[PDB]
Amino acid sequence: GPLGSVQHVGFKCDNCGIEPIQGVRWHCQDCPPEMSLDFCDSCSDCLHETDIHKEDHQLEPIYR
């Protein structure tokens, strides 16, 4: 599945709440299984902070 068609059916954007990230998945690299954040390509410009998600943590594009 190429770009514009990568649809992570079961992995929701924490920032806008789309339940499976379509286009490309932006995975939260440092966040743990409990707080297993993900963003959509509309949303990965975000750099929020929680108890565990941080400005020091990393985002990763997924093209499959």
Binding site: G10, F11, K12, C13, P20, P33, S36, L37, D38
Partner: peptide
């Protein structure tokens, strides 16, 4: 955020 459960294949 994960929304799909892991492939546990037990206690459905």
């Amino acid at each position: 955020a994960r929304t799909k459960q892991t492939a546990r294949k037990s206690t459905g």
